[PDB]
Ligand SMILES: [Cl-]
């Protein structure tokens with residue numbers, strides 16, 4: 001298991017424009033297009049993202065290309081963020097993947113808002129971080145995915161994904 005396999009499990013793959021768990025137009029492997037209610041705004045963001053006239057449909061290679069870019073961007077967002085970088089640097093390789101997963105899902109600013117959890121993660125108080133992580137809109141809205149990520153932080157293993 002690695003971050004790619006992990007997010008592919010959590011996000012799925014769809015080759016036509018769909019709405020994510022929040023109702024936002026999305027494509028591929030959780031690639032958010034726009035938060036706008038307009039399918040035409042989504043189709044336009046998609047053509048721009050892929051560099052061709054797609055009419056709402058992409059190929060698997062195209063979906064994996066956006067995915068690679070998004071994982072890379074999630075890692076870059078962590079390393080650029082004053083609150084996220086020290087936590088990431090403190091973590092082992094498996095728990096780092098858990099942090100990337102959160103940033104991919106909710107963005108750098110959203111995760112940097114988990115001040116208390118991040119501190120507990122940096123201190124390696126795993127059971128406590130896991131309890132605090134769960135007291136979140138994140139956990140209440142997407143409990144199955146959140147539980148898998150939280151388990152990864154708690155155990156430092158891939159057991160929730162195997
Ligand atoms: Cl893009």
Ligand SMILES: [Cl-]
Pocket residue numbers: 141142143144145146
């Ligand atoms: Cl879920």
